[PDB]
Structures are given as structure tokens and as C-alpha cells.
Design a protein around this ligand. Structure first.
Ligand SMILES: [Cl-]
Lengths: 263, 270
């Protein structure tokens, strides 16, 4: 039998897909790793579950622990989902600039939201969380290559049969691109890592993406590949396509992640 | 030595995972598991129906590259697959459809033709039928193949041990197909339809269907809230009903130790 105990055990194992149409050429092959197949729709799922596992293994999370985390975006969704799966109460602080939709979704997962003022931004959210932690010692606030970067790299390695030549990605928050670069480069020194822009020790290049050449590419992806994603994913693919046409990259295998670490 | 790469997202439909429902079942002498059709690219079993229709039409030569796929509306699935495979896609739907749904379809490159709200789906089916007669570029799309595949996955992943399949009927006998296939290899297997208190509901032949449980609607809402909050599984009212039915089955003493399968999102969700 193949049966997961809970949804948090179905994080990862995401698939590669070819980008055949939007690359208009091209001497190199481009493929995308669809982190959207994760339960909560992004690579942040991996970061969330990894944080909880580590804290459990380290004894820092006891069974009556209340996960408390200042958040602004997707890390929060992942945490709420995993917390609910594993039986942890989850309290989340965020500025009141956060969309009603994100709030409702978080509340659907049983997360309790504490809204801080928009003007204070994330510092306001970090501050309230600090404050609450002092209030009650059941509160736990989450926070070389990170485990989720290792796993992600292994999947890219397996599914490209060790042939990946260029990894192309947004910088993102959780040192993910650099971790994956660490692992791939160790087994394949010829491999290149390219950050996409709208620890630079391991990045071989930075492509500042003509923002909104990005929008165009995102539109084509949706309409020509059936892949609907955001501006950062568009930029990533634009960067990959540029790399794909450079003649010194002929025949190379280029991997991009969607949704991109930027989206 | 082998790479594992799909040509396009239409190739990544299916092969969905099972998960145990440990907490919301408060008991229980029987095991309940859910097959997560939400892992499909467009989030439901309808993905399978969409791609299966396009494959059939290709195999039959009825879908040329000189086509526009036309369909009253599943619509998401079609738009996504059409765009993946290179087909122009036109969709008819009542003007009662959400602006959000419309925008999403348009993102996939689907062209929308709005029918009047009062006429409902019949209006959409009618407009589509009329359009097909208007222009010959239009193409309007046993146990069905997508029900067979779904059954095979349930069969494999439960190692042939599934005892009760529990599901909303929905429309078109995807759920009846899956029953046919399981019951054919495992005559001891039971199928239970779930209800609230060829785009119509299937006839429930009682040769196939062993029981109907009427999900005291909202009971269903309660169970949906618990799923989200106790299992991290966020789904709608019909999925809640299905799981409520499954839990009820799971506590009947004559089902002790049986393996009970539901499919989420439940085929009856809106
Ligand atoms: Cl090589």
C-alpha cells in the first residue's frame, strides 16, 4: 500500500515539465520544476515542514506547543496547513496590509491572526510576536545546506538523471537557491547557477529581468503551455530563454522552478 | 539512466495520492482514506475528464489542428489542456458565472461566449449546439477511460484491499464507472452514494449502488471545518458530506477493520 499519514507527508516529489513553446528556438532545453504541485502550491511548503521537523527532533516543540510566526506571504499558509495537520495550534502575526483572501485562507486552516499596523510593516509583526512569546512559554517562533534545499536538489538530480547544466531562479527568502547550488555544484562542478532579479559566492550570474518583459512571458506560458503563474515566474523563464539562446549553451539542460522563489 | 520529464502539464493529470483521515474519524473500527484529486494540475477529477475527451477525439481524427474546441460549461480543465496542446478553445456559459472564473479561463486563452442567466446551462448547451451548426471549424466534445484509470490507481495504492468506496454522484458516472471496475474484481466491495438533504446525475442502478447516505447537509459544514483544522485538508461542503458518510460507515460494527475510500474534492462539489 502507498498511504500517507497526513498531508504534510505529501510535500515534495514535484514533477518536471518541458517548456516547448515559449522558448522560441532554442539550442538548449528548458524544463520547469512545478512546486505548485505541493499541497499549498509553492516551495514554501518544504520550508515549513522542515522547520517543524527540526524543532521536533531538537525537542524545541513539545506536544502542547503553539507555533507563532510573523508572516507576510506564503510561508504562513504552509505553516498553518502543517500545524493543523500535525495537531499544533498556530498563531500568526502580520501587518494589516495583507489581503482579505490570504486572511480567510489562514483562518480556514485554524490559524489565529493578529494584525499589526500597515505602517510598521514586518517589524511590527516581528515585534508583536516577540511580545507574545514573553507572554506565554508554550509559544515557539520558527527560526550547511538546508534540508529542504537538499531534498529539492536531489529531486532535480534524479529527474534530470544528473544532466542539469544551469539552474535558474529568483533569490527568494529562505536561502533555497544557494543551497541547491551548493549541492548540485558539488556533484557537477560544470553546473551554473543564475539568479534572476527585477550569499553571492555561488551565483555565477545575475540577470536583471526587464520587468514586464516578464508579464509578456507569463501570458505566453498560460496561453501556450497551460501554466498560470506570476511576474517572477515570467522573469525566471525569460532569463532561462535568454540563456537558452546563447550559443555557448547549445544542447545544455536548463532548470527553472515554478512558482519561482520570487513569486 | 532515465530522465523523468513530462512534455506538458496535460501529461501530469492523474497519479494522485492517498492520505489517511486519522483525526476526523473519532474512533473507528474501520480505516478511512482519501484520494486527493486536488493534486491534479487544475485541482479536481474534472482534469481527467477533460484530457480523456481530447485524447479520444485525437485518436478518432475528430480533432484536427484546424479546430476550435467548443464546450458549454471542467471548463478550466479544457482550457488548460487546450492551451497545453495548442488548440484554440471557445467556451459557452451563462452570465451567472463569477468574474473570477471568467478571468481564469481567459488567462488560459479561452474565448468566452456568455449565455443568459435565466436560461442556465440549457442556454449554454443550446448556444453551443447552435454555434457548431454555424461554422464547421467547431468541435464539441462501458466504464469511461478516466473512471478506469482512477479505479486502477485506487486498486494499486490500496493493494487490492479497498472495501467501501464512498462518493457524491455528481454528473456523468465517473463515480459509477469506478464502482463498476472495483466491484468487478472485488464483489465483496461496496459502493455508497452520498447526497445532500450527459451533464445530469447518473441513474443509480442498485445492482451497483449498495446504499445512499443523505448527508444531513451541514453536518457536512462541521466536518469540512474539522478536516481543514484537524487534517490540513481544505475542501467544500460536498467533501465534508462524503467524509461524514465515511465516518458513519466506519463506526458500523459490521464494517470493523474494513478499508474505506473517499475522493476529494468530492465529485459533487460546486
Ligand atoms: Cl554529461
Amino acid at each position: 500500500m502507498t498511504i500517507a499519514e497526513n498531508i504534510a507527508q505529501l510535500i515534495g516529489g514535484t514533477p518536471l515539465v518541458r517548456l516547448r513553446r515559449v522558448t522560441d528556438g532554442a539550442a538548449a532545453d528548458v524544463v520547469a520544476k512545478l512546486e505548485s504541485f505541493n499541497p499549498a502550491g509553492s516551495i514554501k511548503d518544504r520550508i515549513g515542514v522542515a522547520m517543524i521537523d527540526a524543532a521536533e527532533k531538537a525537542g524545541l516543540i513539545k506536544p502542547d506547543t503553539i507555533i507563532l510566526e510573523p508572516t507576510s506571504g506564503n510561508t504562513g499558509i504552509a505553516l498553518a496547513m502543517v500545524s493543523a495537520a500535525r495537531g499544533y495550534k498556530c498563531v500568526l502575526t502580520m501587518p494589516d496590509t495583507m489581503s482579505i483572501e490570504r486572511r480567510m485562507l489562514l483562518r480556514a486552516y485554524g490559524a489565529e491572526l493578529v494584525l499589526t499596523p500597515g505602517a510598521e510593516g514586518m517589524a511590527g509583526a516581528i515585534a508583536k510576536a516577540e511580545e507574545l512569546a514573553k507572554t506565554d512559554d508554550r509559544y515557539f517562533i520558527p527560526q550547511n545546506p538546508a534540508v529542504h534545499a537538499v531534498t529539492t536538489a536531489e529531486e532535480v538530480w534524479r529527474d534530470t538523471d544528473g544532466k542539469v547544466d544551469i539552474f535558474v531562479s529568483g533569490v527568494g527568502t529562505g536561502g533555497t537557491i544557494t543551497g541547491v547550488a551548493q549541492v548540485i555544484k558539488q556533484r557537477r562542478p560544470s553546473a551554473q547557477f543564475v539568479a534572476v532579479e527585477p550569499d553571492l559566492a555561488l551565483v555565477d550570474e545575475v540577470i536583471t529581468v526587464g520587468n514586464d518583459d516578464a508579464l509578456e512571458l507569463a501570458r505566453r506560458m498560460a496561453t501556450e503551455e497551460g501554466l498560470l503563474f506570476g511576474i517572477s515566474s515570467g522573469a525566471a523563464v525569460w532569463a532561462a530563454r535568454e540563456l537558452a539562446h546563447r550559443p555557448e549553451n547549445a544542447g545544455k539542460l536548463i532548470v527553472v522552478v515554478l512558482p519561482d522563489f520570487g513569486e
